[PDB]
Amino acid sequence: NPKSDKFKVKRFHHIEFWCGDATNVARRFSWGLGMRFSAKSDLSTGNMVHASYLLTSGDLRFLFTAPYSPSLSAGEIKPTTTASIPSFDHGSCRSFFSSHGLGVRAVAIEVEDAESAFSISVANGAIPSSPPIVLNEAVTIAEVKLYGDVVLRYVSYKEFLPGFERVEDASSFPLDYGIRRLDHAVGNVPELGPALTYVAGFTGFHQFAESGLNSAVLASNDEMVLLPINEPVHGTKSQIQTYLEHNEGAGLQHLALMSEDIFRTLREMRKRSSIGGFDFMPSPPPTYYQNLKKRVGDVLSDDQIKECEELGILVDDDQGTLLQIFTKPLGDRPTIFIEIIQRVGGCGGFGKGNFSELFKSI
Amino acid sequence: NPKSDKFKVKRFHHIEFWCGDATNVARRFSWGLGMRFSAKSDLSTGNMVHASYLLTSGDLRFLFTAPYSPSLSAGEIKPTTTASIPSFDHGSCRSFFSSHGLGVRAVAIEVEDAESAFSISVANGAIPSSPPIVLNEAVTIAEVKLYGDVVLRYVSYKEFLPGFERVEDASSFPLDYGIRRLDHAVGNVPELGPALTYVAGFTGFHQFAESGLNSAVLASNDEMVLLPINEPVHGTKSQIQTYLEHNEGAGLQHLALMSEDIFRTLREMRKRSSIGGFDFMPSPPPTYYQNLKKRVGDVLSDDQIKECEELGILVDDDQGTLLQIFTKPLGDRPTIFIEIIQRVGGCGGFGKGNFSELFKSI
Ligand SMILES: O=C1CCCC(=O)C1=C(O)c1ccc(C(F)(F)F)cc1[N+](=O)[O-]
Ligand SMILES: O=C1CCCC(=O)C1=C(O)c1ccc(C(F)(F)F)cc1[N+](=O)[O-]
Ligand SMILES: [Co+2]
Ligand SMILES: [Co+2]
Incomplete structure (x- = not known):
């Protein structure tokens, strides 16, 4: 263990699955694995781009993202978008899902600084997937190509993510x-x-x-x-x-x-x-x-x-x-x-x- | 009730949903609605084209079909195909699922003769979706455009469909x-x-x-x-x-x-x-x-x-x-x-x- 990590990583943060319907996948995994419905980000919260639902069981976080109709966010551009995860793209998600089916898109790792971890990674040979994006001046996310179409997501804090809303304690069953x-x-x-x-x-x-x-x-x-x-x-x-x-x-x-x-x-x-x-x-x-x-x-x-x-x-x-x-x-x-x-x-x-x-x- | 039906229809037969992953959808609907796992048609049975899983609750039959990788059946043609539902197509299913998401593809109706019902329908203005196909010299299926991308499926008998296999009585829970x-x-x-x-x-x-x-x-x-x-x-x-x-x-x-x-x-x-x-x-x-x-x-x-x-x-x-x-x-x-x-x-x-x-x- 030479401790040769080029930047300080903390631990596993979350796992993001990419499917065509995030609801049916999140409902099955919650019942079959015992993960409570944690947070949501969809049209009910104001997201006209993608439907994301977070399942949590202790520290483990499973995220399930599916695209909406592109005509819903047709009048939007990246600076004024309403997607909670700016790394999302309708073309990449449908390409990922039509080629691999149900699979993991991003293995997220919590780091000290996501903007710094992105620069050190790219400068050492990492293929940049998504540039660092700041979220509510509190959360920063960055993504680089890991292997295949799976990407390594860096996340750093100063709550899951902004734009998401914690579900009501009564509208969710505390499965564990x-x-x-x-x-x-x-x-x-x-x-x-x-x-x-x-x-x-x-x-x-x-x-x-x-x-x-x-x-x-x-x-x-x-x-x-x-x-x-x-x-x-x-x-x-x-x-x-x-x-x-x-x-x-x-x-x-x-x-x-x-x-x-x-x-x-x-x-x-x-x-x-x-x-x-x-x-x-x-x-x-x-x-x-x-x-x-x-x-x-x-x-x-x-x-x-x-x-x-x-x-x-x-x-x-x-x-x-x-x-x-x-x-x-x-x-x-x-x-x-x-x-x-x-x-x-x-x-x-x-x-x-x-x-x-x-x-x-x- | 003038009884002006151009051909003798029996009753509703089944409903076929089109999704990207048929497993997670069939597992949720079975638990949320109480439909037992009836029959299957996938790689375990020899179907290298699509994965189909039938849920039944009394007389109601819910079918869930999802496409495999097209490279699996790349060496096949329509006469020597291994798909249980010959009406299936990789391009139409991914076009249907990328445009509508999770939705019903075919409303199936049992008729006296599927080959005759197809001819009378087309000759009276129906847009032909799939020509009549005979299955094991016992079952005949035909499809015509209903509205939108939903098609009306005719099915006639002389068991659900050939190619499918009834699941084991022990490997399925009799939910009802x-x-x-x-x-x-x-x-x-x-x-x-x-x-x-x-x-x-x-x-x-x-x-x-x-x-x-x-x-x-x-x-x-x-x-x-x-x-x-x-x-x-x-x-x-x-x-x-x-x-x-x-x-x-x-x-x-x-x-x-x-x-x-x-x-x-x-x-x-x-x-x-x-x-x-x-x-x-x-x-x-x-x-x-x-x-x-x-x-x-x-x-x-x-x-x-x-x-x-x-x-x-x-x-x-x-x-x-x-x-x-x-x-x-x-x-x-x-x-x-x-x-x-x-x-x-x-x-x-x-x-x-x-x-x-x-x-x-x-
Ligand atoms: O954890 C790993 C990664 C290293 C190699 C490996 O195969 C691992 C498995 O999780 C594992 C371990 C044992 C078996 C066995 F012995 F049951 F086949 C299978 C796997 N596997 O392929 O997941
Ligand atoms: O069954 C039908 C088809 C005819 C019109 C219709 O709306 C039907 C509904 O199933 C129905 C009935 C009542 C309501 C109500 F009153 F709760 F809003 C809603 C629906 N609906 O749109 O499904
Ligand atoms: Co392992
Ligand atoms: Co109704």
Whole structure:
């Protein structure tokens, strides 16, 4: 950990999904994941450009943005626009959604100064996506191309964003399953070589870490933001190659959401998989948990290990051990999905040893 | 009722929504309305063109179709395609979804013969949308332009559709709130004149029926399919004019879903409005229900009338009385919404008298 970050980054701020209808996506994710309706920005607030709805579960913030009819804001220009997120564009959102479907547009990171972070990034090789825009003389947002069509959004403060309105405490249900923070966001790239040296080039992020894939992890000075990047290899399958085929290019593979009580979260979500929520990947056979008594027998009690077999949880090092489960793809395309992890910054790893442990069941 | 239908139509068959992501829309509607996951047609079944998911609640069938990546079916042509619905097209679906957002694409009606119904319709002035296609030598589907970009789909049998697969009885939750059938589907048109004489021209459907709108209803020989069409008037507001502005053209305004126990359905849905379901329109003041004892006092008991005020239900003629409630718009745009009705074919009317009864509260 040389702490070679070119500028001071704080932590993950929010994740912005781009879809054609932000309502139906925000309603499903809120029920399937337990994120309360936080803030809104649409025609009811005065936004004639895009409809944005924020879901929050602890510190995690999920934003869902969809475009309106361009004729509504036809009489507007950028200086007098009414969009809460000035980085928005009708052409880019419909191009992003027609090429990738439902996917993550921007991985937002809170920094010390967004205007300074934009200049240092661009001067070190970052492709500028959106110039720094000041908002109500309090919030500043900037965006640079991350990989594919996903952009890295810098945000700095001196409340979510201006223009948004906090929903009424009675008009929103305080849903909460246990998810608190965003752990890491992983993206798939055809070549990790040019990608790892690019992202770490304008950020100074240091590297934190039969296979079917090759991957490495970038992290900040305190390992609070973690950006793993994968690359496929041919000669097996290669589920990451099928990602690039169905996603039609690079993009964010999965979001890792941290929870305080992974058993309560998986109990709340598995009871909702078939009533609007999210379906989980197939659980490993008891052979996997028969070997769990040998790997984490001294780390976990048999009553708790057997409970992991009931929910189908994957366990896996030196600094500590982590628990993890993977949700099925979040939409029609077999692309983006969700990973629920519990650690006991970046302690426990990323379940890289589970690839060999899962094959041992056969 | 002259029974002047040019061909024998049976009843409403299904409704097909067109969105960019069929999963998130089908998961929300199933939880918010109580429709079980019926059949699917996607890559898991062999469809490399579109992802379609059928929701059923009694006889009502809601279909949700979204396009895949065109490169997946790039090596296919129409004779050797793998799409379950041959009427599908990547260009039309993305054009429909980029112009109208989430909306109804096809109002399907079961007929005696789809090939004959297509020929009689086209020969009487219908604009052909999709030619008749035979499916597994058992099902025949045909489509003609209805109004705007909505098309009227004819379907005839000799199971939903071939290519689809019935989901497993264990992999689907038997959700059921009480909705059983589709009553009527209403569309907004800039001019009902050219629209009413067009739709009734190639179908022979007879007319069944300060205002802010002008409307008329078309119906079959047995009044089992009901297609009301509205037109705005300027000089008030005009919520139908705002429909044509946000929908960017004509389209289906609202779907009327019939239920057997309107009180149970509204009790199941109102408890789910803030947890992924559908929000309802504002309920009328008790002044509206103070006049309910004078209009339907001899038609309903005070214990049941007071219960209608708790759920905020609208009541309204000669043949009988009907109950009705309107859901808020189903997505980002203030366009398409849902109406829950209970009748005691087409008996009770369409709540046309509620416009004057609602204004009496002031
Ligand atoms: O967290 C990461 C990034 C590094 C490599 C990786 O595959 C990670 C996964 O989240 C992960 C871990 C384990 C498995 C397993 F073993 F279950 F297949 C799968 C994944 N994965 O591809 O998401
Ligand atoms: O069913 C119809 C079609 C004919 C006219 C009409 O407006 C119908 C409605 O479903 C309806 C009825 C009453 C109201 C009221 F009174 F609550 F405003 C509103 C509608 N509507 O526009 O859907
Ligand atoms: Co991960
Ligand atoms: Co109606």
